């Protein structure tokens, strides 16, 4: 019996960036994550791990026969500092480790203090390294710290102009992360700039239940139609969502 929640949940699974970003992470925990990404109904789109775990994750994904699960990682993370040289070095290392995708934190505090240029320059530098390596760049703007709609829009706009391939709400590491309103605002920037073809969206942080995921896909489908949200244009950034999706699908 198909239901809206089952349909949304299978979509969300296939769009997931299945994440572990903890101080106490180890190889064993990343190997387990890789195995969790290969589910009875399909694979997640990606995993998201700290850069040092990329080589062991690649090996694990290959040995279980799922080399098409992408490996994402994070840089300038979680603080979003405004030192471009550091963010770039971290991005270059992520590429060297073997990342398929890099999620860089935008220097949101600098923007809040009136500096629009440093976020442009930081994202552009990281984009140039990634592009040269055929690596996608996601930019985390930290909506829960920016707070104000105008600042969410501005950070989104700057990031897109600088070359972001995705805009991502949050690190998951601050008190407020993805919200439906924040998602709507960011997707409206994509719409307003006419960059639906080249920029994707990622709600991240605190997305824990199948009903939560459903709320975000509903906004995407309203704004861009139900075919837009494929893996190049949409992901769920989540550490603690998959079990709920599988339960909604009857693997729970």
Swiss-Prot record:
Result when mutating residue 138 to L: 20-fold decrease in catalytic efficiency
Top EC class of this enzyme: lyase
GO CC term, one of those recorded: membrane
Any one biological process term the GO annotation gives: deoxyribonucleotide catabolic process
Listed pathway(s): Carbohydrate degradation; 2-deoxy-D-ribose 1-phosphate degradation; D-glyceraldehyde 3-phosphate and acetaldehyde from 2-deoxy-alpha-D-ribose 1-phosphate: step 2/2
Reactions the enzyme catalyzes: 2-deoxy-D-ribose 5-phosphate = D-glyceraldehyde 3-phosphate + acetaldehyde
pH dependence: Optimum pH is 7.5 for 2-deoxy-D-ribose 5-phosphate cleavage.
Annotated keywords: Acetylation, Cytoplasm, Lyase, Schiff base
Listed SMART domains: DeoC
Active site (UniProt): 103 (proton donor/acceptor), 168 (schiff-base intermediate with acetaldehyde), 202 (proton donor/acceptor)
Localization annotation: Cytoplasm
One GO MF term attached to the UniProt entry: deoxyribose-phosphate aldolase activity
Keyword Nuclease listed: no
Mutagenesis or variant effect for residue 168 to L: 1000-fold decrease in catalytic efficiency
Variant or mutagenesis effect after changing residue 48 to A/S: 3-fold decrease in catalytic efficiency
Any Pfam family matching the protein: DeoC
Effect of residue 103 to E: 44-fold decrease in catalytic efficiency
Keyword Ribonucleoprotein: no
EC number of the protein: 4.1.2.4
Residues annotated with N6-acetyllysine modification: 168
Tree of life domain: Bacteria
Quaternary organization: Monomer and homodimer.
Function statement: Catalyzes a reversible aldol reaction between acetaldehyde and D-glyceraldehyde 3-phosphate to generate 2-deoxy-D-ribose 5-phosphate. Can also catalyze the double aldol condensation of three acetaldehyde molecules, leading to the formation of 2,4,6-trideoxyhexose.
UniProt similarity note: Belongs to the DeoC/FbaB aldolase family. DeoC type 2 subfamily.
Protein name: Deoxyribose-phosphate aldolase
Organism: Escherichia coli (strain K12)
């Amino acid at each position: 019996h198909m239901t809206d929640l089952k349909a949304s949940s299978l979509r969300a699974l296939k769009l997931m960036d299945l994440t572990t970003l903890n101080d106490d992470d180890t190889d064993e925990k990343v190997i387990a994550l890789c195995h969790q990404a290969k589910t009875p109904v399909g694979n997640t789109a990606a995993i998201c791990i700290y850069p040092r775990f990329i080589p062991i994750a690649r090996k694990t994904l290959k040995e279980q026969g799922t080399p098409e699960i992408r490996i994402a990682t994070v840089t300038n993370f979680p603080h979003g500092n405004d030192d471009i040289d550091i963010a770039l070095a971290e991005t270059r290392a992520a590429i060297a480790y073997g990342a398929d995708e890099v999620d860089v934190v935008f220097p949101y505090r600098a923007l809040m203090a009136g500096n629009e240029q440093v976020g442009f320059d930081l994202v552009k530098a990281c984009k140039e390294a990634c592009a040269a390596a055929n690596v996608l760049l996601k930019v985390i703007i930290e909506t829960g710290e920016l707070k104000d709609e105008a600042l969410i829009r501005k950070a989104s706009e700057i990031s897109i102009k600088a070359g972001a391939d995705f805009i991502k709400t949050s690190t998951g590491k601050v008190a407020v992360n993805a919200t439906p309103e924040s998602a709507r605002i960011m997707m409206e920037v994509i719409r307003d700039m006419g960059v639906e073809k080249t920029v994707g969206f990622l709600p991240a942080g605190g997305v824990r239940t199948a009903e939560d995921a459903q709320k975000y896909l509903a906004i995407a489908d309203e704004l861009f139609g139900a075919d837009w949200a494929d893996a190049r244009h949409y992901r769920f950034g989540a550490s603690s969502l998959l079990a709920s999706l599988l339960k909604a699908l009857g693997h729970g």
